[PDB]
Short mmCIF file of C-alpha atoms and ligand atoms in Angstrom, two decimals:
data_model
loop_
_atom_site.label_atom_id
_atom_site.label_comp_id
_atom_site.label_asym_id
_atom_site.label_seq_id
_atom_site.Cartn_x
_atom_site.Cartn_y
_atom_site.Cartn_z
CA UNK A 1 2.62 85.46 -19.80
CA UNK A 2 4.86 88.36 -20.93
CA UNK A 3 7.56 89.93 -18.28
CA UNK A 4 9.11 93.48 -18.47
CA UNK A 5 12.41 94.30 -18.16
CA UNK A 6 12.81 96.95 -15.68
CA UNK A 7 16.02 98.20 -16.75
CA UNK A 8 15.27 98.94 -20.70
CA UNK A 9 11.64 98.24 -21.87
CA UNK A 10 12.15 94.87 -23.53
CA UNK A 11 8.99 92.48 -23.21
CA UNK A 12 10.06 88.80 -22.91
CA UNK A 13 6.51 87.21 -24.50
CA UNK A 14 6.28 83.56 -23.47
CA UNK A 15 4.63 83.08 -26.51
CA UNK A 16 7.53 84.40 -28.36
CA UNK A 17 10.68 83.29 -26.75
CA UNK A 18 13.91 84.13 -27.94
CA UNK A 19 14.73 81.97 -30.70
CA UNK A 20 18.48 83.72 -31.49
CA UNK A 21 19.51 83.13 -28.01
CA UNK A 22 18.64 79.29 -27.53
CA UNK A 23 14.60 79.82 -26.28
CA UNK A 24 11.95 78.68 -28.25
CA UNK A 25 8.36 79.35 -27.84
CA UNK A 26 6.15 78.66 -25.42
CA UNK A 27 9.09 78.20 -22.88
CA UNK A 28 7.98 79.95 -19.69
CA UNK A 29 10.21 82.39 -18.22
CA UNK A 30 10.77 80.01 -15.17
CA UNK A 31 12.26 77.45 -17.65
CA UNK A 32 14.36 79.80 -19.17
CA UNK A 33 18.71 78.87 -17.91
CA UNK A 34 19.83 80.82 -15.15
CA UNK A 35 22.37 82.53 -17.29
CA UNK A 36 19.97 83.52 -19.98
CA UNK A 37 20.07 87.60 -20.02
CA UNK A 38 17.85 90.53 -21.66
CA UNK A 39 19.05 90.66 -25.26
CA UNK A 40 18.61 93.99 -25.07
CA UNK A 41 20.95 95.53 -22.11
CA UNK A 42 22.25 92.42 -20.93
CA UNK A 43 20.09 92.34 -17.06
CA UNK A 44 19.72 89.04 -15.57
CA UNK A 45 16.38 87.64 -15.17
CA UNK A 46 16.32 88.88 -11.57
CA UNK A 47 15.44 92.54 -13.15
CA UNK A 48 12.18 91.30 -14.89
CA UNK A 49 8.88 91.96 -13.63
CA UNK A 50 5.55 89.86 -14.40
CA UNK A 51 2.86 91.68 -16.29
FE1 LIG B 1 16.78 94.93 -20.71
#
């Protein structure tokens, strides 16, 4: 699944991850640590929207 950020445009692909800040892929966005935060401005993952 891939999940927008509403606050800048970033796409978190679950398929992706985000390897530079500790997710690898195929971890769900669910999975992801509470403190993990758009690499791009910084939102927390309450600002992210399923696509
Ligand atoms: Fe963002």
């Amino acid at each position: 699944a891939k999940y927008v950020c509403k606050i800048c445009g970033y796409i978190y692909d679950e398929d992706a991850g985000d390897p530079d800040n500790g997710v690898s892929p195929g971890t769900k966005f669910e999975e992801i640590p509470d403190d993990w935060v758009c690499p791009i401005c910084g939102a927390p993952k309450s600002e992210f929207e399923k696509l």
